[PDB]
Design a protein around this nucleic acid. Structure first.
Ligand SMILES: [Mg+2]
Ligand SMILES: [Mg+2]
Ligand SMILES: [Mg+2]
Length: 69
RNA sequence: GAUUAAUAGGGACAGUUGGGGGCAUUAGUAUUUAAUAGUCAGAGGUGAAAUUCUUGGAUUUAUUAAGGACUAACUAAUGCGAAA
């Protein structure tokens, strides 16, 4: 290996809104700020496709409901 | 002084029924393309292959947008229309 391609990558934990569990569900990858590119702002519009893996108690039976965040 | 009133036909009317028609509306993924992000070396296609596309970054992934079509699944020895 020479220079792992993810060298510049920062990770972020997803947080779910009021109906769902406050606990993070997944994590996302983004490139570091370049002085033009602002790290936080490259993520303004991203879209998360999840089950209810997102409601701790009630989740396990509903794999049938997809939620976009 | 006007025959009945055809399980003849025309008309009226009443609750329906239909994927019948004409206008408007309106959705839905899909193909194709574009944009914005990603990532990389292969994608396609075939019996094998080769023409093609690919580092100017394809195929692939996410989110939108444009544009013409088309109405899946439910869908059937079911329906409507004179037939198409
Ligand atoms: Mg469209
Ligand atoms: Mg359309
Ligand atoms: Mg029917």
């Amino acid at each position: 290996r020479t220079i792992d391609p993810l060298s510049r990558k920062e990770w972020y934990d997803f947080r779910a809104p009021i109906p769902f569990s406050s606990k993070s569900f997944g994590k996302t990858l983004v490139t570091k700020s370049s002085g033009n590119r602002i790290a936080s702002e490259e993520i303004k519009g991203r879209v998360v496709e999840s089950t209810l893996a997102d409601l701790k108690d009630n989740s396990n039976d509903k794999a049938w409901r997809k939620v976009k965040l």
